[PDB]
Amino acid sequence: VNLKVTIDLSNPMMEPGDLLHLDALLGALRVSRARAEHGDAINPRDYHYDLPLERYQAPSGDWVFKASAFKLK
């Protein structure tokens, strides 16, 4: 749907030393949702790639999600 997400927050955020990717956050939330359904005894790595994001494919393997790292205003 080619969309943009803005997040505003109450307390100031712990500033990320490296890039805070949107796909990382959505994968962690999908892992938390998978812990909600199938309990805590899961592999997190089977579900954080099941995301509502498209995947860009590099020419030699090595796909990435179509999300971007968060920009701070």
Partner RNA sequence: GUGAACGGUGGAGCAACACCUGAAGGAAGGCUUGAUGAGCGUGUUCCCCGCAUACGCGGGG
Q: The tokens of 51 are what?
A: 């995301």
Rounded CA separation 57/48 (Å): 17
Measure CA of the first residue to CA of the last residue in the chain; give whole Å.
Answer: 24
Binding of residue 73 to RNA (CB under 7 A): no
Residues in the chain: 73
| Binding mask of the shown chain, residues 4 to 43, with x at each position contacting RNA by CB under 7 A | ----------x-xxxxxx--xx-xxx-xx-----------
Give me the residues that bind RNA (CB under 7 A), please.
14, 16-21, 24-25, 27-29, 31-32, 44-45, 48
